[PDB]
Ligand binder design. Structure first.
Ligand SMILES: [K+]
Length: 263
């Protein structure tokens, strides 16, 4: 069946000329709203949530892991590293690298998290451990953002990522301390105001992770606390036919607004 919400998301998708994938979980009743929910999309930087959560899971058996220094060398700098470049020829802790990756989308910081997990396949291993059979990380930053149509590398489905984000932030995939840390980090995101958040009422509070890549790929994954409602999880993924296409955060906002109106 096609709901009124799915009809409005299809109309939005048409006007955009790209491809849109949406997955909502409403924890009030565990109901789901999906648009292209089982199609694969490039994750781009939304993958940083899985990498930071995998290190948080390691910290459950190592009290001092998050305080562990990691050397930052000039050769470690990549395309976008606004926090790591200040610590070149110094160190950042795994807590600092996690925060920089999630709240500033620092790509050097994500590469340290990946290196701490033994490479991209270590992030995929953690996804499988928490019951995500869809997620795959294949590359480091920035080449995991190539977002080539039809490429299975560094992809997931909206349905899979909404379920995983729910487990990580509201469920018991992490210990209580670690779950709270991940939520604090997401809530402190600096990059999300033009994406999901822009489509929701101001009074609602959001923790989110954005992503952007080639093919005008514009993504956001969010945990939403509506005024007077149980929390929501929302995934919005958007990708465009042309390698050089512009970002379209406003499409994610428009998708979020349709979803909110549909509650
Ligand atoms: K782009």
């Amino acid at each position: 069946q096609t709901s009124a919400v799915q009809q409005k998301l299809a109309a939005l998708e048409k006007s955009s000329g790209g491809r849109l994938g949406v997955a909502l979980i409403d924890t009030a009743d565990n109901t789901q709203v999906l648009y292209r929910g089982d199609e694969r999309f490039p994750m781009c930087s939304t993958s940083k949530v899985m990498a930071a959560a995998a290190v948080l899971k390691q910290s459950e058996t190592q009290k001092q892991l998050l305080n562990q220094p990691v050397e930052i060398k000039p050769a470690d700098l990549v395309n976008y590293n606004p926090i790591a470049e200040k610590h070149v020829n110094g160190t950042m802790t795994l807590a600092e690298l996690s925060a920089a990756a999630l709240q500033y989308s620092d790509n050097t910081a994500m590469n340290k998290l990946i290196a701490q997990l033994g490479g991209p396949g270590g992030v995929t291993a953690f996804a499988r451990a928490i019951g995500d059979e869809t997620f795959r990380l294949d590359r480091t930053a920035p080449t995991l953002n190539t977002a080539i149509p039809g490429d299975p590398r560094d992809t997931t489905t909206p349905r899979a990522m909404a379920q995983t984000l729910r487990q990580l932030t509201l469920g018991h995939a992490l210990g209580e301390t670690q779950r709270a840390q991940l939520v604090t980090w997401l809530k402190g995101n600096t990059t999300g105001a033009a994406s999901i958040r822009a489509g929701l009422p101001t009074s609602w509070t959001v923790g989110d992770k954005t992503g952007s890549g080639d093919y005008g790929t514009t993504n956001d994954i969010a945990v939403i606390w509506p005024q007077g409602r149980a929390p929501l999880v929302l995934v919005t993924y958007f990708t465009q036919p042309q390698q050089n296409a512009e970002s379209r955060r406003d499409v994610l906002a428009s998708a979020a607004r349709i979803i909110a109106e549909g509650l």
